[PDB]
Write a protein that binds this ligand. Structure first.
Ligand SMILES: CC(C)(COP(=O)(O)OP(=O)(O)OC[C@H]1O[C@@H](n2cnc3c(N)ncnc32)[C@H](O)[C@@H]1OP(=O)(O)O)[C@@H](O)C(=O)NCCC(=O)NCCS
Ligand SMILES: CC(C)(COP(=O)(O)OP(=O)(O)OC[C@H]1O[C@@H](n2cnc3c(N)ncnc32)[C@H](O)[C@@H]1OP(=O)(O)O)[C@@H](O)C(=O)NCCC(=O)NCCS
Ligand SMILES: CC(C)(COP(=O)(O)OP(=O)(O)OC[C@H]1O[C@@H](n2cnc3c(N)ncnc32)[C@H](O)[C@@H]1OP(=O)(O)O)[C@@H](O)C(=O)NCCC(=O)NCCS
Ligand SMILES: [Mg+2]
Ligand SMILES: [Mg+2]
Ligand SMILES: [Mg+2]
Lengths: 268, 268, 268
């Protein structure tokens, strides 16, 4: 039940076991990384550390290597000596890549054009429990050079893939995870992203530094002004029958659902 | 031939029959609503109203309840006592949901992640004559809480689904209907939306208040500046062979088509 | 190997053979146009010009007419008398339209809703070596009247299709070609577009005037500021193993790939 954890998930390289406990303490869910966070020469040591420094398997996911690679094979061998049951699959590009990871639960990280093109097949695969997107491998594999424009906003194709993943995940009832914010000190930019992610239905914002978790948790709580409105409209709705105008707005079922969702997030 | 009616379509709850004639007078097409506009407890009375206060079936559509619901069964039973032949299907999620509504004409309202993912299949279904998108059920079903950002623009996933629906509809020659504007007094925002809808090829902007119709109709006629240009380029084109530069712009077939479409709209 | 040619491709109407050598001199690759650049009445003459005034077939593409048209038939007949082996297919709408052009290499120009819906199938077709998108026929066929909003940006549906084609192209290892800039003297607007195109992984910006070519070649060279950063981060990486923080940013494999890609571009 990762769907009950909290929105602040945190990457930690698997070759840094001295930080595992810190990460577990700071975050709702830790993603121990055997992939791009760790250099090739350091992967074997990272795998040893996984086995030798267990976190709670109910709140820890392991990002393994891409399908068909020698590393993934070594990863799955190492995982056989752990109690970890959920993995994150990078460069997820087909349903088959997820299905071969049975009986583990899988979070598919779509971060290539092929993955975007196949997002719905990947989402529908049986072991999938969530979908994440990655802007940086996406731009890298497209042969590009930057995921953001001068003003910091994501370039269109990244914005496009983010929506693609959110819909693919939601269409098949999977968790949706938003991309990492690479500018560590940029709490302002992270706050804006997290608030928007929360508004559109993402379940999680993945973080790369523990200082980011409190920003993400706060961002997933609706503002005082949003909560006041949620309260007002739901109260007025108790006296109405069908569509009605409230504070100049046409309100009915899905709008009341937004209000309920806001109060739910405030409560939990 | 809804195709031949104006762009101003107007929802009216079916449990408000004293407003039917008003709605029919103000709008090009009326959508009598048996779904979210009407509370569950009032649906039977709305169904009775549908039978007892008929509107011109050549300019009226009935939004029924979602596929697989007991409410949709009751709606279709009530529909049997009417002349209405076009229905709007909310939460359209598969070609099958549309096909089972034969022999009626169907406008598919895609307002869920699954709908967006399956948009093209829904558009290609035989009884489909139109596609609409719905931002609020979309966000609600995603688990989100806000369809628009602080400055009022639709969030990315809504913009994405809008374009998805326009393309799916056009690829199969269906009418495309743009989403409702819930801020009733926000004539400014409606105007902005409706002008853009007209410019990209939407056939209709759906309205929730009769005061919105005049705004939509005006927004769908190109501005004086656009029409002057259309006239100029087309005049110039009659003495042209192939691509040519007009007022510093490269002009060929599709640009001339744009100009003709403007003048056609001014004509209509 | 059009992939090894620069990013500056130039359309020239096939009924203007006195400009062929000029085109060839200015551009990296010339696209000789038998479609919309040429009026129907001038097409047979254009076809004679193609035969009578040959360009280097290793650096020339021919845009033929759409699938199923009498004009395409005549285009292919005319082409049998040339050494041209790559064609551009306008209004590309299915894999079948591409496959029937074997054994020639095909750049599929997607510029209709159907094309956008079928983009991945088109890209995957065996003869496809490139995908381009066309904003003006897109709006034209949707029944719209302008591809850009007041401030000059492309409307959403065009931005949507652009990303769609970039992903489809890249998912199947095809060249990705960005859309023409119709405002000839707007070199500032072209610069912005081309820089973004290069940043997200487009291989080509297609031009309609030889004055645009220098702008495009310059835009595909990363700025002094970006190159400075690429040098720094890659130098720093040779001292690191795995993810590291550089100048406040989380850095790992794909980001370093971005840097390498910038330097590769500066080298070319
Ligand atoms: C980028 C990174 C290497 C920075 O290292 P750094 O220079 O040591 O960062 P800081 O100096 O700001 O460290 C601050 C504190 O937080 C800790 N910390 C930083 N990142 C951490 C992480 N991902 N997990 C656990 N603890 C972390 C540090 O250990 C340090 O703790 P301490 O002062 O109590 O000893 C680190 O943030 C990191 O590993 N991020 C994740 C990278 C990753 O996994 N990428 C793969 C997918 S994007
Ligand atoms: C939101 C709503 C309930 C507001 O009702 P309201 O409080 O009466 O709004 P107003 O006071 O501004 O109404 C003004 C006039 O316009 C009429 N009117 C308002 N909305 C109307 C509608 N959708 N159809 C017909 N007439 C309408 C009212 O009857 C009133 O007429 P009158 O003065 O001649 O008697 C109403 O706009 C409505 O029902 N909209 C449609 C809701 C819907 O169908 N949602 C589902 C799909 S999104
Ligand atoms: C738009 C167009 C007709 C402009 O005509 P124009 O008025 O003659 O252009 P200019 O006056 O700026 O010409 C300037 C010079 O560039 C040349 N030139 C302009 N466009 C050229 C082209 N597409 N190919 C080769 N040479 C071109 C002209 O011959 C002229 O050369 P010169 O004066 O050194 O002898 C011409 O640019 C053109 O044909 N563009 C392509 C249209 C097209 O192919 N559309 C279909 C796909 S989008
Ligand atoms: Mg990655
Ligand atoms: Mg709805
Ligand atoms: Mg075209």
């Amino acid at each position: 039940n990762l769907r009950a954890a909290g929105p602040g998930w945190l990457f930690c390289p698997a070759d840094r076991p001295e930080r595992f406990a810190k990460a577990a303490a700071a975050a709702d869910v830790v993603i121990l990384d055997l992939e791009d966070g760790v250099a090739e020469a350091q992967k074997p040591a990272a795998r040893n550390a996984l086995r030798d420094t267990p976190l709670d398997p109910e709140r820890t996911v392991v990002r393994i290597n891409a399908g068909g690679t020698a590393d993934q094979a070594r990863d799955l061998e190492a995982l056989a000596g752990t109690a970890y049951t959920t993995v994150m699959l990078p460069k997820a590009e087909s349903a088959a890549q997820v299905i071969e990871l049975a009986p583990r639960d899988v979070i598919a990280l779509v971060e290539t054009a092929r993955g975007a093109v196949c997002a719905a097949e990947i989402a529908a695969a049986d072991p999938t429990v969530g979908m994440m997107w990655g802007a940086e491998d996406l731009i890298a594999t497209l042969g590009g050079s930057s995921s953001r424009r001068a003003d910091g906003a994501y370039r269109d194709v990244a914005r496009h893939v983010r929506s693609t993943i959110l819909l693919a995940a939601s269409a098949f009832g999977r968790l949706a995870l938003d991309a990492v914010h690479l500018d560590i000190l940029d709490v302002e930019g992270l706050q804006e992203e997290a608030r928007d992610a929360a508004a559109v239905g993402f379940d999680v914002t993945v973080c790369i530094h523990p200082s980011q978790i409190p920003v993400v948790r706060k961002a997933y709580r609706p503002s005082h002004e949003k909560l006041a409105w949620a309260r007002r409209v739901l109260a007025a709705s108790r006296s109405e029958r069908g569509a009605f105008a409230f504070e100049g707005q046409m309100v009915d079922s899905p709008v009341l659902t937004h209000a309920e969702t806001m109060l739910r997030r405030a409560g939990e």
